[PDB]
Each structure stands twice: as C-alpha cells, then as structure tokens.
Amino acid sequence: LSIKEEVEKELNKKSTAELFRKIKNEKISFFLPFKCLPAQHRKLLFISFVCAVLSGGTLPFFISVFGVILKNMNLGDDINPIILSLVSIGLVQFILSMISSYCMDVITSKILKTLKLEYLRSVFYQDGQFHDNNPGSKLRSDLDFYLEQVSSGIGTKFITIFTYASSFLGLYIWSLIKNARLTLCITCVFPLIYVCGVICNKKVKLNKKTSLLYNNNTMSIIEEALMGIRTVASYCGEKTILNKFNLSETFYSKYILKANFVEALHIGLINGLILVSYAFGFWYGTRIIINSAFNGASVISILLGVLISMFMLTIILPNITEYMKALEATNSLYEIINRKPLVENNDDGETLPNIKKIEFKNVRFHYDTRKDVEIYKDLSFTLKEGKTYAFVGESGCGKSTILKLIERLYDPTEGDIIVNDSHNLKDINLKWWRSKIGVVSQDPLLFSNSIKNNIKYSLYSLKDLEAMENLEMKKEYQTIKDSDVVDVSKKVLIHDFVSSLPDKYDTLVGSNASKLSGGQKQRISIARAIMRNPKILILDEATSSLDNKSEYLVQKTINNLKGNENRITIIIAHRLSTIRYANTIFVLSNRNEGSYIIEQGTHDSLMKNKNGIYHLMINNQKAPNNLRIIYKEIFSYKKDVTIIFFSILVAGGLYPVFALLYARYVSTLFDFANLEYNSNKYSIYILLIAIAMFISETLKNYYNNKIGEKVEKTMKRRLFENILYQEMSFFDQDKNTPGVLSAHINRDVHLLKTGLVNNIVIFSHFIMLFLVSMVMSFYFCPIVAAVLTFIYFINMRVFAVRARLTKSKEIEKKEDPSFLIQEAFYNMHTVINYGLEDYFCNLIEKAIDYKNKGQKRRIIVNAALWGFSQSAQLFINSFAYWFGSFLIKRGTILVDDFMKSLFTFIFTGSYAGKLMSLKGDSENAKLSFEKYYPLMIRKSNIDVRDDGGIRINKNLIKGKVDIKDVNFRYISRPNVPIYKNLSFTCDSKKTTAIVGETGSGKSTFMNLLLRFYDLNGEILLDDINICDYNLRDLRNLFSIVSQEPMLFNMSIYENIKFGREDATLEDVKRVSKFAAIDEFIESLPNKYDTNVGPYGKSLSGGQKQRIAIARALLREPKILLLDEATSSLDSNSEKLIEKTIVDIKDKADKTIITIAHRIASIKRSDKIVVFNNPDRNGTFVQSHGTHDELLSAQDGIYKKYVKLA
C-alpha cells in the first residue's frame, strides 16, 4: 500500500457521533436490511436474540465465585460442588453459541441473494439514456463491492453487541449493590483516559496532514523528472533537482516524528494508570474492612468486575461502525432498484393488426450529457409497406441513432413517428414492436454455449407471446423444432460447414465463440436475424467481409422470402453492390448541425441523376547478501540500539513481577494480623512498577520509528540518485516505465520501514517474556506448568480454531452463477433486443443448486468450531483449580507456590497474545528488495560523473561538425533500418538547412550529436572524434530548441536559469528582451516569481516556446540546433518568433543547424541538404550546396519545395 493512500484512509474515517448525525437526519432506520424476509426467517432472529442475552450472564457468575474459590483453597475446605456447578454452564453456553451462527449465516445468505436478484432486474430495465452514462463492466464492479460491505457486518458479529452489554450491566450493577463507595472511587481514573485520547488525537492529525502536504510535492518532482529526462541531461540538470527533493523530505520526517511521539506516549500512559487503579482499589478496600469490625473475597472480584466492564466498551464500538457502514451501503442500493425507467412496459399498449406505413415528421433530439451536439435537422419522410428500400450513410451519419429510434431506446423531442396514419409510436406495445426487428449489428454477438442455441434464441420472445394470450412458458420451448435450423442454415450456405465436422449442432462454441472465424460468426448472426421472418429488417455493416455470393443469396432470400407481400425491409450497407435495384434510395448524410434528405430516386434514376456526392460514390467504389546490507546499516547507530535493549529488558523483567506481587497480597488479606503494614508495603511497589513501565514502553515505541525513518531516507536517495545518471537505452526498455519506477520508491521503502524493523522488536520482546515466565513458573511448582504447557500446545498448534475458521471463510468468500453474470453484460444489446427472462430465472437455479450441499456442511461445522472457541478457557481454569486443590490435600504441594505459578502464566499469556497482533508484511518487503536492488548498484557505461578525458575550452572552437558514415538501428525493433551511409559537413558559423520527406526520421541526427546512443559510423568535431571529450563539456556548448518544450512547476526565474545556477536577474531581463516576452511578464502580479502550474499548463503555446528560446540563449551557445520555431502558433507570437529567428541568424557568431520549410529562411541559407527514402531500407544524401541559386539545374525535389513554399 502507498503512503498517501495509507494516510487518507486514516483521515477519511467517521466516528460514531458523526455517522449517527449523518444517519438520523434523513430517516435511515436501524431495521432496513431486515425487511426483505418471510415470517419463517423473521423469528429465527428472535431465537438468536434470546440465545445471546443468556450467554452474557456467565462472567458475572465466574467472577462472583472466583474469590470464594481462593478463600476456600487457602483456608482448608473443598470446592468440588462449585466445579460441578461451573461446568454445566460451559456446556449450555456451548450449545447456545452453536445455535446462533447457524441461525444467522442462513439469513445473511437469503438477503444477499434477494438484493442481487432485484438489482439484476432493475438493471435490465434501463432506457438506453442510462446505459450510455453507466456502461457495462462498472455495474458488476460496484455490485461485488456493496455485497462485501453488507456480509462482513451483518453476520455473527452483530449479535455480539448484546452479549457484551448484558455482561456490562450484570458486572457493574452486581458490583454496585455490594458496596458502591468502593466501585465509584475506582472508575474516576477512567475519564482521564478519554480526555487524554481526545487531546492527543488532535495533535496527531494536525501534524499528519502537514506531513501529507510535503509528500505530493516530491511525487510531482519524481514523475516530472522521469517523464522529461532527455531535457534534463542536455542542460546538465541532474543536481539542482536533488536539492528540492532533500528540502521537501526533511519537513515530512520531522512532522511525522512529532506525530509518533504523541502516539507513543498514550500507550505508555494507558499501561500506567491501570496499575495505579489496582493499588488504590486494594488500599481503600483494606480500610473499609478495619472500620467495619464484609469478607476479603468481596474485594478480589469487584476489581475484576469494574476493570473488565470497561473492556467491553472498547470492543463494542467497531461493530456498530460496521453496522452503520452496512446500512449506508444498502441505502446506496435501494435507490438503484427504485429508479423510474420512463419507457415502462405496462403490457397494455394497443398493438396494430399489421405493420404499415412508417412515417417521420420533423424530429429533433439532444443528448443528456452532450446537450449541444445535434445530429438531425429535418427528419421527415415516409416508408410504405410491401416494397423494399435501401439507404447509404457515412461513418458518422446516425445509422446507430436511427436504429435506436426505431428500436425506441430514446423518445423524440419535437416531432412524431406516426405509423399506419393513425397510430403514434408511443401507443404500440414495445414488447410487440421489437418482436419484428432483425438487427445484424457490426460485431457478431454470440454466446458461449453452442451453434444451435444462439440460433434458437430468436423464437423465445415470440413463444412467450403465446401462453399468456390464451403458466405454460417454461416447457413450450420444446415446441421449437430443429428442422428450421436446417433450412435457415442452408439458405446462408452454412449447413454444409456445420454438417461437415462432428458434433453438428451440439458442438460448444468458445468463450464468446472463440473457436470459429469472424466471417463465419457473422454468417451465424445473419442466420439468427433471418430465422424469425423479420418484418422491419435493419442491417448495419452486415455483409462486409462476405464476398458477393453469400450477400446476393441472402438478398434473394429476403426479397423472395415467404410472407414478403407486406413488409418494410431497410437494407443498409456501405458496399454499393447491394443497391442495384431499389424502390427508393434516400442516401442519408449529415452535411454538420443536422441531417436532411440530400438525394432521391431509384438506382436507375439516381446514379445518373446529378453530379453530386452519390455521383462520387458510384464513380469511385463501383539473495542473502542483499539483506545483510540492511543489517549492516542498522547496526551503525550505537546510541539508539542500547536504549531499546535496556527498555526491552526492563519491560520483560518487571511485568511478570506484578503477577507474583498480586499473589503475595491475596495471602496477606486473609490474615488479620498486621494487615495495615503489609498493604502500605505492597502498594508502593506497584506505584513504582507503574512509573517504570510508563517510561519503558514510551522509549521503546519512539526510538523504533526514529530508526525506521533513516533507512527509508537513505535508500530513496540512493535509488533516485542512481536512476538519473543512467543511459537512455535503459528508459527505452519495456519493463522500465516511469510509473513502475515511481511506485517502488514510495511503496516498498515504506514497507521496509514498517515490516522488518517493527517485527524484529516484537519477536525480541516476546522471547524475553517467554523465557523468564517459563523459568520462574517451572521453579515454584514444576508439576502444574508441564500440564498447562501441554494443554496450550495441543490447543493452539493442533486445535487451531480461529485459523481453520478463516481458512474456511475466506476461501468461499473468494468464490455457474459467476460465469453468466459476466457474459450477460457484454452481450447486453442482444437481450435488450430479444431474450430477457431466460436469464431472469436461470441465475436462480444455478445459484440454488450450489447452496445446499456445501452450505449446510460448512455451516454445521463452522458453528461447532465457534462454540468451542467461546467456551474453552472456562474448562481449562476449572481443571487447573481442581487439580491444584487435589494435590494439596495429599501433601505434595503448598498453596502460595501454586498461586504464584498460575497467575504469571495467565497474565503473561494474555499480554503476549495482545502485542503479538501488531505485525506488518515481512515477506513482500524482503521480496521487492530483491527486485529493486540491482537498480541502485547498476553501472551506466555512459556516465557524466566521469572526469576523465580531454578538457575543452570555449575559446579555440571553430564550430565544424562532420559525419563520414552512419548505420543506426534501434534495439527496441531490430528490423527497421533508418540510415545508410550518411556523410556530410557543416563548416563554421554558417546556416545549414534540412528539407526532406516528412516522418523520415530527421530528429535523430540531434540525439547522436549529443551522445544519447553510441556506435557503427564516425562523427567528428573539429577533426577529433566525439568519444574523447569528457562529455560534461560536450553537453555544455550545444543548445537545442525542440518542437515541444517542457517547463517545470517552479518559478519562471528558475526555469530560465535551469542548468546555470550562477547568473544574475539582469541577464534574464536582457535575454527575455530578445525573445520578445518582456512586456507580458510586465503586465502581471508576481512578474518574475509567478509559479507556473504543473507541466506549464498555466501558459499558452506562444509564451512557452519563447521562454525556452530565452533559456537556450543564456548559455552563450556555440552550436545551435533549431526545429521549426514557427509551426502552429497564433499570428502575433508567430511573427515575433520569426523576427527573433531572423535576428539571431544575422548576428554571425555561432554555427547553426536548422530544420526549415519556409522559403524566406531557405534563401539566406548557405547550404541545403536533402534527405530521401527511395525504398524502405535507409536514407542518404542526394544533393549538396544548392542554396537556391541552383533551384532548377537538374531534376529533383528542391524545385517542388521552393514552388510549394
């Protein structure tokens, strides 16, 4: 997980007091999911309700007999009746906890089924206008989201709110009736915990948000430097990017450490006030006794009662949050099911006797999103029955929209679509209209069942109009015989192919028919469309891939199909061989704000009508090392490790002492002699232990993160400093992308902070507890500790309950009801056309036949696994006390030894199990580090940091640049040669123009000239080769001006000083005057300090490139490399740029190489070099030294580009 997301998840959470105010003020009841239920499922809720309040009255009994057991063991009498009375309660608790999970998971399954089976329905009755807004794969990306917010908050962890409240009430009020002045004076230290929490969380969030503020800046820097890399190298700006990074990272570090300090203090203080509560409770208890003469067994239990009463309020609250979450998720779904379709199928529309005389009258339409993009102007004409038609439209006319208007996805806005001169479109039953339209769409939309069933899905919507008009719909699909498939396959000439291979009609087509060819799939789609004898045939790019044979045979079929005496066939295709004969062809076009009839006439009187657009149509067409690096790094901080060491030893040493100090107090409380002095002596020790455990935990939890930060901010530096100095072939590979390279630096380095150097400390502290506890529990009473260890071993590692539980839960949570949902939303526009309730009642059967056999076994097992989880510690403690009281009455063991060897074991087990769940991801952080470690130790082999080579002065530079031969070929595609035997010169201080074919690869001379790609060939600068120059000073005399510049998110004054950090503002004012931009900058607030936006998006294209030209002229360049500085800008800036260019070239000081195509610059050019690509193998030079005095002396291309210019 990323850092930004991890902080936003913590910041975007609402407390219960906020969700309640959000949930009350629009009447979202607490009983919303439990209103889709029969009565047979409505009273299992009551059963599971009363089978939970009873299981809460267990702890108020054990806590009431706990002190009496001890008073009875250390005084001489027996305890067997108490045990016999205490085991039966465990048994009935097991049974009452076995009931509830069974009774609840069933209900969850039921409601989770019903919501889905209503959602699918409400989705399948949208009106097209909606489908355009929320298309397809989103809806099943939201469904499975909501259906895992409601199931993880309405299961068995909704009934555990009433058990805990029952236990709360019982404990507290039993503790209050016995003696109130004692329990009141114990729960007065607890408000000080809530107050500290609310005071500290604020100081946490205030600093954490300011930490987040300084993080996205670094993200922007990294992405924006990894994107524009070849403009960072050519100006030698690898260094002045790192200072911003290091200045932006330190604020983040210091503020998040300020947060972690407060986050660590709270823990230590919560672990310190409780131990004071114990001591003051005992001290005041022993003073209400002496003043009385109320036994001592009514002081050992009140403390546990009042102290465990509040532990329930620390675990009730998350479940209420999850329940509110489930509510707001369900009420984010009962608005989708209850949306109005506005094209409703009332099943009452008066239908025609037959379809006759379709007629349009002046229909206009606007979308809902694009409320200003019109397609129609004057749609008005007539289409009569019995005779054929045909139409022709371009790729943006609206054949799709006419289809959606005859199919009636949309309604008209202005006109009307009266049919048969007495019936409007909005009176016909939509069920019956679509029943006589055969659409052959662009792509073949076939399912993944067979070749026969995709064909036989046509007649279902008609056979469904036979039973209701007399249920009988489920079985009458057998009436559809297999003899119609025979002849309808013969007609399209596919019967031979489907009969040639085995499994004639039973062969299953692939996933969306991924076995056959596209043309054959379109043939099957056409056979599907033809099979039902459609009345209004609407083709759309139907016979495109077919040859003339199948097309013309289908045409013969349609125009001679039985029952064509009364039809309106609308055959629409782009191949103009289908329109040889037609009763009328209104060729349709949209020429832009709306279509209209452009032509009219039969094909005999249309191809020769006029010299219009249809004339053009008929005329034209016719591995271990890597981590010991980290362990070397960690063990170089000598002051921060010793404090952690000492604090771990202190905590692990002084926490177990509290147990055997709690047992020396019991034995002196049943001894009326000198009770006062003993209390005075045994309370001060607990005060001291609290004061020590505060400091120990605080300093253990702070220096941990203090160590964790530095490993990050010394690995990020190495990565981001090593990536910049790498050559360009690195960035050209496939798996070396800016996104994946920027994902590592944040995610996996934050994981190295969390995982490793959090999970080391946990294991160390755990072992330090486990050694000493096992030692001084095996020393007082050896016989008991062996038995207790055997018990917990055979429990945790052999009867792992919560492990098997989640292993059975998440597997079925991960999981044909899941294959049809997917392939029903892809093929939506076929079920909207025809076939709608076959899948309304097929998902139900496939869903139900997988419930029972698995669900009932899984749920009768997972309840037996939960009951034994809730009712295990009781039996263990009972057996322990029985065995202790058994060995005592035969002399083998004393009392105090047992009472000291028991409590240590108990409390240390609880505390160890507590802190052992704070771990992170230790595995993936050791796995990623093997991916991204070779990147911080990779060699570059074109390295600018090398200071070995011939130093070069700017004084003795002539400026000649020569090439003798080149043969270049990219490694990302080693088949396309580009250059072949390029050889020419550029002498000194003279212009050299480059004209040639567009896209021939002219912008690669430049890159080789700056050493981005090494070599075959030979390049020369002042008669010396380029690989002997110490390229620091080679890149420090060139200066490019590319087609598109790139600016950064810094000020303008800094973007102009990129590379050269030592230059006054007067030079910037001087050079911005020659770029003709020192008037707009003097019209603005914060003139030379206006922070432009990211990627320079707060400027125009005519202001950006003049800033670039100012950036290129500040370096005092010796060789200038221009590329069409006046391409696609507005008039004023373009003219200013021509003025600057023609001003530079007059000041003959520097050698210049341009890429020009305007004749005004060619004339002054002193040399012109043509590039040509005769055949697709390479380019080379064909002309030399024309300079427009040789404009026509031999036959060539320069004459073209001077008469075209």
Curated annotation (Swiss-Prot):
PROSITE patterns: ABC_TM1F (PS50929), ABC_TRANSPORTER_1 (PS00211), ABC_TRANSPORTER_2 (PS50893). Changing residue 209 to Q: Significantly increases ATPase activity. Gene3D superfamilies: ABC transporter type 1, transmembrane domain, P-loop containing nucleotide triphosphate hydrolases. Residues 46-325, 643-918 form the ABC transmembrane type-1 domain. It catalyses: ATP + H2O + xenobioticSide 1 = ADP + phosphate + xenobioticSide 2. GO terms for biological process: transmembrane transport. Residues 1-48, 100-156, 201-263, 318-640, 703-759, 802-867, 914-1205 are cytoplasmic. GO terms for molecular function: ABC-type transporter activity; ATP binding; ATP hydrolysis activity; ATPase-coupled transmembrane transporter activity; metal ion binding. Keywords: ATP-binding, Hydrolase, Magnesium, Membrane, Metal-binding, Nucleotide-binding, Translocase, Transmembrane, Transmembrane helix, Transport, Vacuole. Changing residue 311 to A: Results in less ATPase activity when stimulated with mefloquine or halofantrine, indicating the role of the residue in mefloquine and halofantrine binding. One of its GO terms (cellular component) is food vacuole. InterPro entries: AAA+_ATPase, ABC1_TM_dom, ABC1_TM_sf, ABC_transporter-like_ATP-bd, ABC_transporter-like_CS, P-loop_NTPase, Type_1_exporter. Pfam families: ABC_membrane (PF00664), ABC_tran (PF00005). Residues 70-78, 178-179, 285-296, 662-681, 889-892 are vacuolar. ATP 2 binds at residues 515, 517, 519-520, 970, 973, 998-999, 1001-1004, 1043. Residues 358-591, 961-1203 form the ABC transporter domain. CDD domains: ABC_6TM_Pgp_ABCB1_D1_like, ABC_6TM_Pgp_ABCB1_D2_like, ABC_MTABC3_MDL1_MDL2. It is found in: Vacuole membrane. Energy-dependent efflux pump responsible for decreased drug accumulation in multidrug-resistant cells. Transports lumefantrine, mefloquine, chloroquine, quinine, quinidine, amodiaquine, piperaquine, dihydroartemisinin and quinacrine. Can transport human ABCB1 substrates rhodamine B and vinblastine. Does not transport amantadine. Belongs to the ABC transporter superfamily. ABCB family. Multidrug resistance exporter (TC 3.A.1.201) subfamily. PANTHER family: ATP-DEPENDENT PERMEASE MDL1, MITOCHONDRIAL, ATP-DEPENDENT TRANSLOCASE ABCB1-LIKE. This is Multidrug resistance protein 1. It comes from Plasmodium falciparum (isolate 3D7).
